[PDB]
């Protein structure tokens, strides 16, 4: 729930502001977990070197890079196969630091998403700066935490968690009611965990 | 910090008890993150279909399986390449349910660990029951949470979190002082997060 700003407004933020660019790669998923639970969509995130879940991407120094080229530089290191353009640009948000966080997002086919996972495990940053990709489970199991709420209970780069829920909403992959519900089950799971 | 019990004591627990078997695959890692931070060891865990971090493995029905064969059944589905024996058996612990959790652990070479990651992304359960492998960062960064404490802040299968810290200790991959320290930085990070 960051403050959204227009693309052109973000580009007037220069030296005072650092810029980050991240990629949300996702695919329609017709499969069913256990033959029973529709998966609907699969979204890629990653375990970062700092032990947090985030999106592929990183900080882009505008002294040296366009946002596109700087993003693809980092995607080349950590995913090693795909390149995004301004066609995929989705949002800019304001955030310790003054950072404008840009989100790019692209719908892939499910096998294209799998190809990204296969190239990631051979990438230059795999095992160093990137410690593995994970798929976001977007379903919720019968106990009401299995799946997406449990997943939201992990530790994120805060801007990544905000961007994921923002994108799921504006891309109409999940209604905002269900996002608020899942976030609420996660936070209460977390508070119920802190009882020891 | 589960109650440890002897192998033979666990085998006297039959029908009243469910049994789980998990694999801790790890490797000495001579590399340095950013050229600066010794990585020491790499441990494999995975994002499970329920949105929690855990170890490769699962529940083993002793009506049908030995613990070894049942473990390798699940490893075959989710990792697709390696098989463990009783030579790798490390511990049994008592835990909603009456479960004896058995931990197997094997030191691999770093490239053998990478081969496991490559076979996992082609496995039968990848994208369904297993949503991706991740490496555990065992270093701590200068801010005292980057790396291992942040990683411990994620959401685990509780038995998996206990088994990881138990194994790091008894395998002498990390002194217990440092484990308690990292767990303490994680829990306080979590509590400081629940302020919103």
């Amino acid at each position, epitope marked *: 729930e960051l403050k959204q700003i227009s693309r052109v407004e973000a580009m007037r933020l220069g*030296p005072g502001w650092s810029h980050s660019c991240h990629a949300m790669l996702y695919a329609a998923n017709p499969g069913q977990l256990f033959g029973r639970i529709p998966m609907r969509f699969s979204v890629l995130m990653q375990m970062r070197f700092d032990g947090l879940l985030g999106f592929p991407g990183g*900080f882009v120094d505008r*002294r040296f890079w366009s946002l596109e080229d700087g993003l693809n530089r*980092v995607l080349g290191l950590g995913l090693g196969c795909l390149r995004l353009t301004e066609a995929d640009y989705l949002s800019s948000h304001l955030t310790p630091h003054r950072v404008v966080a840009h989100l790019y997002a692209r719908q892939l086919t499910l096998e294209q998403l799998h190809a990204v996972e296969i190239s990631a495990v051979h990438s230059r940053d795999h095992g160093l700066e990137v410690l593995g990709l994970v798929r976001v489970p977007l379903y919720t199991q019968k106990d009401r935490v299995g799946g997406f709420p449990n997943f939201l209970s992990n530790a994120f780069v805060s801007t990544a968690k905000c961007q994921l829920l923002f994108a799921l909403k504006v891309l109409n992959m999940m209604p905002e009611e269900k996002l608020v519900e899942a976030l609420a089950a996660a936070t209460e799971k977390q508070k119920k965990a802190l009882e020891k | 910090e589960l109650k440890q019990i002897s192998r033979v004591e666990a085998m006297r627990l039959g029908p009243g008890w469910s049994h789980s078997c998990h694999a801790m695959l790890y490797a000495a890692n001579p590399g340095q993150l950013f050229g600066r931070i010794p990585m020491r060891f790499s441990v494999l865990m995975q994002m499970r279909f329920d949105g929690l971090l855990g170890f490769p493995g699962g529940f083993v029905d002793r009506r049908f399986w030995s613990l070894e064969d049942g473990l390798n059944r699940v490893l075959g589905l989710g990792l697709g390449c390696l098989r463990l024996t009783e030579a790798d058996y490390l511990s049994s612990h008592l835990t909603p349910h009456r479960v004896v959790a058995h931990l197997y652990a094997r030191q691999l070479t770093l490239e053998q660990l990478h081969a496991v990651e490559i076979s996992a992304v082609h496995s039968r359960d990848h994208g369904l029951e297993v949503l991706g492998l991740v490496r555990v960062p065992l270093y701590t960064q200068k801010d005292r949470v980057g790396g291992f404490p942040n990683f411990l802040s994620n959401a685990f299968v509780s038995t998996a979190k206990c088994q990881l810290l138990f194994a790091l200790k008894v395998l002498n991959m990390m002194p217990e002082e440092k484990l308690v320290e990292a767990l303490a930085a994680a829990t306080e990070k979590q509590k400081k997060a629940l302020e919103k």
Partner: nanobody, 119 residues
Framework: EVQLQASGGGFVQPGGSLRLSCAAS????????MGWFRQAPGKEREFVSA?????????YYADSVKGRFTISRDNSKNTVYLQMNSLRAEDTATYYC???????????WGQGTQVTVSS
């Protein structure tokens, strides 16, 4: 904190040559970018050249220095070099080394080194 240390510069006769060096210390990364800016009399600080540590792309140059300046690196020393040839009066300026990388937000600047081209 990434600290930048620079070497070289000073007085140069027109058409001569001069080589700047710059290294990064501290919380550096493995994949990073380093380059040079300069501020000439009555102008704003302008891009000169940049290079990457990882062959991510080809080093680039300002149009006014193409074919005269060449940037190069030694990532065993985390050091980059600017070889300035066929120096002209237009090249008189304070030159600044820069460092950044994809894994931390800060864009770092070194201290200015004066290059003075004059007969």
């Amino acid at each position: 904190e990434v600290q930048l240390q620079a070497s070289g510069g000073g007085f140069v006769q027109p058409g001569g040559s001069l080589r700047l060096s710059c290294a990064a210390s501290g919380t550096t990364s493995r994949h990073y970018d380093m380059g040079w800016f300069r501020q000439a009399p009555g102008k704003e600080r302008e891009f000169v050249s940049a290079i990457s540590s990882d062959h991510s792309r080809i080093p680039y140059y300002a149009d006014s220095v193409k074919g005269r300046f060449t940037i190069s690196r030694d990532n065993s020393k985390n050091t980059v070099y600017l070889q300035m040839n066929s120096l002209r009066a237009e090249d008189t300026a304070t030159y600044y080394c820069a460092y950044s990388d994809p894994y931390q937000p800060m864009s770092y600047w070194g201290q200015g080194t004066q290059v003075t081209v004059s007969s």
